[PDB]
Structure 1
Amino acid sequence: PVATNGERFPWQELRLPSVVIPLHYDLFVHPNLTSLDFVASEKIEVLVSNATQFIILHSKDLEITNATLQSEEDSRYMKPGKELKVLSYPAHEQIALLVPEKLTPHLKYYVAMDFQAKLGDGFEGFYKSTYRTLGGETRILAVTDFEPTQARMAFPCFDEPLFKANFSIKIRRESRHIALSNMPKVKTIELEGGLLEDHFETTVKMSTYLVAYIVCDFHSLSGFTSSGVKVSIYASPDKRNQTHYALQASLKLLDFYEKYFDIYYPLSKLDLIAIPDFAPGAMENWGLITYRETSLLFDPKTSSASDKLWVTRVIAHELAHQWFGNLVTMEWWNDIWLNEGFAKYMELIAVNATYPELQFDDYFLNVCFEVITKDSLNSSRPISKPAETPTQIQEMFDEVSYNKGACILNMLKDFLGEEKFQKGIIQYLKKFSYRNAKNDDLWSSLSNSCLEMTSNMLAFLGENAEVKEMMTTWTLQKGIPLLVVKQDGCSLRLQQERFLQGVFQEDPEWRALQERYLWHIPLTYSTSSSNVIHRHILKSKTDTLDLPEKTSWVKFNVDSNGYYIVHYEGHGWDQLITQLNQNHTLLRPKDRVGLIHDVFQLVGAGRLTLDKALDMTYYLQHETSSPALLEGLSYLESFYHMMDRRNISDISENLKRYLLQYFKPVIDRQSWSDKGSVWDRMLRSALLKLACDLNHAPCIQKAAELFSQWMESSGKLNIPTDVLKIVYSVGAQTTAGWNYLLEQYELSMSSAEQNKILYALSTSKHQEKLLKLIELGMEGKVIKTQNLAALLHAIARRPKGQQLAWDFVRENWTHLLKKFDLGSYDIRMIISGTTAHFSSKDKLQEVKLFFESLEAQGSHLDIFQTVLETITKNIKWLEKNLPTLRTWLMVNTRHH
């Protein structure tokens, strides 16, 4: 309605008009890494579908100087063309190009624009990044990051994922720099002044948010896949030795993704570059995937086995995105899960297929449990929810769109079989190649999948209808269902419910939270007598089944492959617990993990008492399966840290004693080395970290001895990676070791070692030392600002830093909003990581007042409600179960 120069804007909708459709961008960028600014020009080929007097596109923080319109099909706009009037509307981040004469439909025009801006200083758009060399030199590079709505900060464009087009990129650079982009380099021309100009191959049809171009001086290692794709791993020169595994894994993973999807990677080259200053974990720019140094680089001397697993995960995630994201892109950000959820799920398939030795199949259950934590609350959301403003679009990248989408995909695969599910995937990818799809399109392609007139045809059409109907309820409804199972000789009564955390069965608002929710749950169950898996689809609120066997216990949801919680009435829980204590080996390992998880969730839900869960944790002395052991230990360790965060010293000390005593044999048999399998090493790390956290004398002595030897040798003696973080943390307890660790941090060349050292420094007791770490992170010179969100979290969870971090966030909010966006993942993680652990009425009131203060200033986020409800959850869990824990621990002291 208005503009910066007055006058009216010929558009209101924050969505661009569908009239002018782009076809081809000609993008020339001239960045100057000395003045830290860039000048650029573009020529967009547009197709006019309806007669209009104006074109609307996106532009943000770009000074536009020249704007012309040419046409080869409309003679009125012949060469050299006419000038266009530019109107700016920053409220919607749009600009309007006013044309002198109405354009003709079904024709093609060319929009040329010259613009310029400074290199950004944050994490978005075309921004500047620095790295440190081995000798101490500091170098500068320029990198792009556009997802979701930041491509408009680099060049004016139709910045929506539906407006796919081709891209011809040209970059002007000095001789000391190289230029990378999406496509390979076709030609380099030498300029008069001595500069160089790189011309890149034209890109295929793709959305704007995947455009990338980098000017740097990195070194790379190259390799070729089976299908001839040139994979190159780029990184800072002094770090080239850290890229070997990243190349090996990318090659293998790319070959698998081609074989599995039956579609070749279409570009001739694929580049993986490790950016020093990078906010997200990685970004899937087509042919130029940018990574954090901790997500791509692997150094055997300082990287643990878990680091190897994370690097493999992120490479598999980003490579899978090349199909689920670049090849087939969503229609709009409301269905963001169509990209992210699939990629998260494809991690499991790809890693487990290519690196089964990493045993990521056992770890996948955590992905679902993390969302169950947030889905059992009223403040959750459906996987497909509309979004409009850029902040809302950024908020769509949450655990819902990622993990929940991945988990229901795994549930649907278990229901349909791997062959049928794979065929549906291949049909979906081949059908929507180089275009966009939506939620309904995916479910149609997945249900109407052909493995490898008749009654088989009628059952095939009925079952495809069934599948589509089933998944529609899983994507359009929030929450997670709870299955109540009641046994009766041969009868089995099944009830479905909306599982709620911290809202019991009789609470006055529990019936107002059971409104219209109903799920088509594909139940699977096995019995104590027959190992045969039984399948049944629950389509109503209540149902009954019959199994002629009359057995002891019935275990529903085999391997927890279904997105639901099971509850057993009567003697069901007692039968299962007795089964575990006698011979846990009769139940499947994933069944044990699901049982432990579900038991503790129901204890919070009010369907079970805490002593029941604590009595189940008795069999953990007989457990050998690492996942189940680590699950129970994590619950007990969470209980200890929940007590220690408060001043409850008696319960905390009793929990420490029980953990050190009941789990002494497993702790003592652990070595201080990097030997064994992946889960063997991860079990060692977790157990030794737990023991050293509880001030166990042998752990502390061994860690102090290792740290003393390492410091006296000055890096010459080697600490095992699996124990590296533990040793450094213990060493940081002394001012001498603390300062030495900070100095080694500044001088280190391994990002993994730096991450371990930073954690170690955060485990200090002195208030001034933690505050200095926070201030260093804010400054961004020694400790990079990209680590701030993580650092604050590590400090706030500990008792000494809880109030310090909370005070810092409340006081320096305005300074934080200058470094990150409101909807950015960093701000969301800062708020949650400093507030969600609170479990008192006073802290809940403080957080409520803080969020209200953030309101009325223009800042609103969904994480506000989620944090509040979680703090409320914690308060209710304490008041309802605190004396029970006390009594159980005291009873254990007397039971011997």
Structure 2
Amino acid sequence: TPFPWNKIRLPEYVIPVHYDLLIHANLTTLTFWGTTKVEITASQPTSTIILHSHHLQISRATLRKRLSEEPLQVLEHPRQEQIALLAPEPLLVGLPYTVVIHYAGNLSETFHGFYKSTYRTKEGELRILASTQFEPTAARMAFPCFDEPAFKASFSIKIRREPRHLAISNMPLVKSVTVAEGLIEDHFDVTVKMSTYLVAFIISDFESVSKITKSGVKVSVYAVPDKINQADYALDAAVTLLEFYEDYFSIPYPLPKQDLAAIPDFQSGAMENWGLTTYRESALLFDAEKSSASSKLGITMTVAHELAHQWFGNLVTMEWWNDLWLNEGFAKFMEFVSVSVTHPELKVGDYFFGKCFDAMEVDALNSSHPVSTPVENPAQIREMFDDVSYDKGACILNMLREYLSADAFKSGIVQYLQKHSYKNTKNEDLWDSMASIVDVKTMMNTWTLQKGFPLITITVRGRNVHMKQEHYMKGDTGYLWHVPLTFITSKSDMVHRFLLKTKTDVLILPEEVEWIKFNVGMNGYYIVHYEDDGWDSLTGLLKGTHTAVSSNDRASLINNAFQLVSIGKLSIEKALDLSLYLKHETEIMPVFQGLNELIPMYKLMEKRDMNEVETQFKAFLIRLLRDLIDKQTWTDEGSVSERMLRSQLLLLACVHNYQPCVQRAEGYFRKWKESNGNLSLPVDVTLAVFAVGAQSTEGWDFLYSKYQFSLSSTEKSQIEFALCRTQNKEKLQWLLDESFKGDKIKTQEFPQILTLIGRNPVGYPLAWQFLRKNWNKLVQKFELGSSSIAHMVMGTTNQFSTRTRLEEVKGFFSSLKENGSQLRCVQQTIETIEENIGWMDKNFDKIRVWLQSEK
């Protein structure tokens, strides 16, 4: 009667070998039935079998061993998400048993488990499909199982369905059998050995398009019938990228087919289920007339990410979620490795360092965590899907690859994948594989087992270049790293290398130089400070001959300058003085970096009684970029980088009431409205045009009236953004209510809408209030620890900068007890607000005076 197992982790001594899964789902009553048969063996004689089960009603369980069979008593521990099957006789070690479980459940109304998705046909008919999302811990909501990623097994899946529905799963359909009136049973081929979280199945009326790889794999894209004509780009990209990975690793994709399914309701961007990868419609479907350049880039990179997982994640899987980065850091990194070859015109390698700066935002906080760090419950496991695992993980891999050389790195990765195929790995296994080709292990332990990153301080005395490292933290630790430093000088644009393994060291230049610049191309996961006249020298370089260093080296100097303000190593005035070089900048990365450093400053001011300085700061920003803004054409011409730069600059200028852009935007919007929304605008100007049009009641209502009928993910995204920019608080309240409800705007959009309104200069109180009042339902929908909940917490609170706002945040989240008070995103936003308070207290008046002098 008392539950015989009191640990969250399963026993290690009962091991599954093979699952037979029968699923019978009813898309009218929104219920399903299942029969799960799992072949198991026991290392220790045990009479209790413990496995995972969550929100399933177990009707019967039996144990099979001359084909004997006997009943098992069923106990449940809902908190541990486990059931116990008690046998009459102890199991015999080494002998194969089969556990048979019959159960029922309800389709989930969330975005995980076996869940309901809906869409409307062009005439307004509601259609229902059922889809799966199991990673990390939701397979147990669809079938009882040993639901930890190291208990790999093969899966034979059978789906019972109505004739009107199509079923697809991980493997090809090998047989369909009519089993009763109006009931067909689909048999799918057995999977290779894999983790439970990769099982997938979808029952829908999707259509598809297909293409065969040179290696014979059938690649298909599935989508709702009204959107299948948008699948062509992703289909071509998936074939090219699958071919790339197969040839790059020389490890073939092992399955006969690869499906890419666009799901109408989906929480993350995509999911790598082996043989059946799934996507938000916005991450897969491309409209040649309406999709933006950034949306095309996003599809390319998301497909690259999911296909990378077929090797990094599916073939080779981390042993436990503490090492999730072995899946996610690699897949994030592989997006850039692959697409830089398959789509050279996208020039994605130029964009990579930006992920590293994103990671450094959270990693500079005490509340960050090491790349590899212990987790136990599902909320903590979901918290591992964060910028540390993804962005820092990819960034330290890039750093290691540059240090070892690409060929040595690749040889280590190939050996790693071959050795651990169909098995599970830990941090140490990766370092051992890399070393089999230098003390990689000691070096990479410093980057994976402690949080944060170092500040490298450079002091030059003639030819003598002194170096110091210290942990960078916004206001003891003693952390030290093995830092692979790089530098160039005024006399040498060769990349020079120095391994700093101690707190201090020195190198001797062959001849004196006029400047030196560390972290070449921003490939290292560290920041740099220059003592003495260093920042003056580099500021003079940027203002005199900025092309003396690369565009990404310029972006790195902009970013680091403002990071040093936060720790008192550089004054805000000197960092702002450096940003003035941007009046002659032309390139997207340093322009975007300037925006990423300066916009957050007025976002803080917007939430304070600071209208005068806020206005003057925004005027400074427009004046700084005015020549570049004025040069933009109102077209879709040019490269992907030119298109994204154009769109962001025109949006920025219009949001800040730069009259030349506002007048042009108003005229386009009036014409678009007069055409009854049938006018083809340049996609690259549509954000600015819609954002301006939405400022009036009539323009907002008209924009919303066209949202219903759009089949374009970009158009829907552009309308959502514009509607969230209104200063009409009643309209902002409506957007929150309706996207929360999910009928007129899908709930998958709510996290973004909440964040957009949290950034609205008049809406931010509404967003914070809405989060507090509707917390419990939002958690039920998206789950504690999810990235969705983290971004809603940060997006409504992390631009506050007063003690009163800080106490609201602390008071609210501490009141949640077990329903959120321990979230890592809460500690992070609290620490961010604390930094914001100190930063504004110190620098606000300095910025005010600097702007007055800037005249």
Asked if TM exceeds 0.5, the reply is yes
Of residues 713, 729, 733, the one that matches 2:691 is 729
Matched, 1:637 2:586: no
Q: Would you say the 8 A contact 2:486–2:496 is kept in 1?
A: yes
Partner residue of 1:694? Answer: 656
What is the match of residue 17 of structure 2?
23
Distance 2:358 2:368 in 1: 13
The Cα shift of 1:641 comes to 3.1
State the shift of 1:814 in Å. Answer: 2.5
Where 2:690 maps in the other structure, the secondary structure is helix
Offset from partner CA, 1:280-322 (integer Å, 9 cap, x none): 1111110001100111011122211011011111111111001
The range that moved more, 407-416 or 546-555, is: 546-555
Other structure's SS at 1:143 match: strand
Match of 1:193 in 2: 181
**Is the deviation greater in 583-592 or in 830-839?**
583-592
Supply the distance in 2 between the matched residues of 1:331 and 1:673 (Cα, whole angstroms).
50
1:794 aligns with 2:756: yes
Q: Is the 8 A contact 1:822 1:859 kept in 2?
A: no
Match of 1:526? 488
- One-letter code aligned to 2:571: T
C-alpha contact (below 8 Å) 2:813/2:820 kept by paired residues: no
Q: C-alpha displacement at 1:859, in angstroms? A: 4.4
* Partner SS for 1:883: helix
Which structure 1 segments of 5+ residues have no match? 1-6, 450-462, 504-512
Kindly indicate whether residue 800 of structure 2 is the aligned counterpart of residue 838 of structure 1.
yes
2:335 and 2:240 map into 1 onto residues whose CA distance is: 13
What is the aligned-residue RMSD (CA, Å)? 1.3
Query: Does residue 481 in structure 1 map to residue 454 in structure 2?
Result: yes
User: Counterpart in 1 of 2:554?
Assistant: 592
Contact 2:157 2:188 in 1 (8 A): yes
The residue type paired with residue 749 of structure 2 is: N
State the partner residue of 2:722. 760
* Match status 1:381 vs 2:333: no
2:515 alignment partner in structure 1: 553
Amino acid at match of 1:481: P
Instruction: Tell me the distance in 2 between the aligned counterparts of 1:693 and 1:682.
Output: 16
Tell me the CA shift for residue 125 of structure 1.
Answer: 0.7
Match of 1:674?
636
Deviation at 1:855, TM superposition (A): 2.5
After TM superposition, the structure 1 stretch with the greater mean CA deviation from structure 2, 598-607 or 527-536, is 527-536
Aligned to 2:260: 272
What percentage of aligned pairs have identical amino acids? 54
Find the counterpart in structure 2 of residue 509 from structure 1.
none
Task: Name the counterpart of 1:92.
Answer: 80
Separation (CA, whole Å) in 2 of partners of 1:680 and 1:412 = 31
CA displacement, residues 622-681 of structure 1 (integer Å, 9 cap, x when unaligned): 222221122123323333333233221222222233233333221111111100011111
Q: Contact conserved, 1:142 with 1:214, CA < 8 A, in 2?
A: yes
Partner of 2:812: 850
Q: Which residue of 2 aligns with 1:300?
A: 288
**Residue number in structure 2 paired with 1:346:** 334
Take 1:288 and 1:743, find their aligned partners in 2: how far apart are those partners?
35
Query: How many residues of Structure 1 are paired with residues of Structure 2 in the alignment?
Result: 855
Question: Deviation of residue 251 (structure 1)?
Answer: 0.7
Separation (CA, whole Å) in 2 of partners of 1:531 and 1:859: 51
- Is contact 2:724–2:760 with CA below 8 Å preserved after alignment? no
The answer for the alignment partner of 1:359 in structure 2 is: 347
Paired residue for 1:601, among 521, 538, 563?
563
Q: CA deviation at 1:724?
A: 1.2
Match for residue 89 of structure 2 among 91, 96, 101: 101
Deviates more, 1:773-782 or 1:847-856: 847-856
**Mapped partners of 1:710, 1:432: distance in 2:** 57
Q: CA deviation at 1:816?
A: 2.2
Which residue in 2 is equivalent to 1:610?
572
Structure 1 residue 233: Cα displacement: 0.2
| Partners of 2:135 and 2:197 within 8 A in 1 | yes
Alignment-derived partner of residue 41 in structure 1: 35
CA contact (8 A) 1:796 1:834 kept: yes
Distance in structure 2 (CA, Å) of the matches to 1:685 and 1:202? 48
Q: Secondary structure at the match of 2:385?
A: coil
1:875 CA drift (Å): 1.0
Are the aligned partners of 1:175 and 1:196 in contact in 2 as well (CA < 8 Å)?
yes
**Counterpart mapping for 1:422-461 below 5 A:** 422-449=410-437
State how far apart, in whole Å, the 1-side matches of 2:282 and 2:183 are. 34
- 2:764 partner letter: Q
1:828 Cα deviation from its structure 2 partner = 1.6
Distance 1:396 1:90 in 2: 23
1:500 equivalent to 2:462? Answer: no
Instruction: For 1:533-548, list aligned pairs within 5 A.
Output: 533-548=495-510
Rounded to whole Å, the distance in 2 between the matches of 1:206 and 1:12 is 27
- Is 1:60 the counterpart of 2:60 in the alignment? no
How do residues 147-186 of structure 1 correspond to structure 2 at under 5 angstroms? 147-186=135-174
Q: Which amino acid aligns with 1:139?
A: R
Q: Could you tell me which amino acid in structure 1 is paired with residue 545 of structure 2?
A: N
- Assess if the C-alpha contact under 8 Å between 2:561 and 2:570 holds in 1: yes
Taking the aligned partners of 2:150 and 2:818, their CA distance within structure 1 comes to 34
What is the DSSP-based 3-state SS (H/G/I as helix, E as strand, rest coil) of the residue aligned with 1:148? Answer: coil
Distance 1:186 1:530 in 2: 63
Secondary structure of the corresponding residue to residue 369 of structure 1: helix
- Which residue is 1:810 aligned to? 772
Which amino acid counterpart does residue 824 of structure 1 have in structure 2?
A: S
1:645 touches 1:798 (CA, 8 Å); kept in 2? Answer: no
* Among candidates 123, 139, 149, match of residue 135 of structure 1: 123
Cα deviation, residue 137, structure 1: 1.2
Q: 1:784 to 1:579 in 2, by over 3 A?
A: same
Is 1:860 aligned with 2:804?
no
Code of the aligned partner of 1:473: T
- For 1:715, the equivalent position in structure 2 comes to 677
What secondary structure does 1:205 align onto?
coil
CA distance 1:640–1:15, change in 2 (3 Å):
closer
- 2:400 equivalent in structure 1: 412
Contact 1:131 1:138 (C-alpha < 8 Å) held by counterparts: yes
Q: Matched residue of 1:197: which SS? A: strand
Shift of 1:194: 3.0
Question: 1:370, 1:723 → 2: CA distance?
Answer: 27
Alpha-carbon separation, structure 2, partners of 1:244 and 1:342? 27
1:202 & 1:538 partners in 2: Cα distance?
51
Please give the alpha-carbon distance, in whole angstroms, between the structure 1 residues aligned to 2:583 and 2:821. Answer: 50
Deviates more, 1:114-123 or 1:632-641: 632-641
Q: CA deviation at 1:98?
A: 0.8
Q: Distance in 2 between matches of 1:567 and 1:344?
A: 29
| Residue in structure 2 matching 1:879, options 834, 837, 841 | 841
Q: Report the counterpart of residue 685 of structure 1 in structure 2.
A: 647
8 Å contact from structure 1 (residues 331, 436) kept in 2: yes
- Structure 1 stretch displaced more, 861-870 or 706-715: 706-715
Which one-letter code corresponds to 2:713 in the other structure?
A: S
For 2:269 and 2:531, how far apart are their aligned partners in 1? 44
Q: Distance in 2 between matches of 1:842 and 1:15?
A: 42
CA displacement at 1:857 relative to structure 2? 5.7
In 2: Cα distance, 1:604 partner to 1:234 partner: 49
Q: Which residue of 2 aligns with 1:455?
A: none
The reply to whether residue 491 of structure 1 matches residue 464 of structure 2 is yes
Structure 1 residue aligned with 2:708: 746
Distance in structure 2 (CA, Å) of the matches to 1:351 and 1:778: 36
Structure-2 separation of matches of 1:628 and 1:824: 32
Partners of 2:91 and 2:76 lie apart in 1 by 21
Distance in 2, Cα, partners of 1:373 & 1:757: 29
Give the TM-score of the pair, scaled to structure 1. Answer: 0.94
Amino acid at match of 1:356: P
Measured against aligned partners, the alpha-carbon deviations of 1:328-356 in whole angstroms (never above 9, x if no partner) come to 00000000001011001111111111112
Q: Residue type matched to 1:185 in 2?
A: L
Contact 2:271–2:279 (Cα < 8 Å) also in 1: yes
Instruction: Encode CA deviations 1:819-873: one digit per residue, 9 max, x unaligned.
Output: 2212222222111110111111110111111121123667421111100010011
Any stretches of 5+ residues in structure 2 without a counterpart?
none
Structure 2 Cα separation of the partners of residues 14 and 637 of structure 1? 44
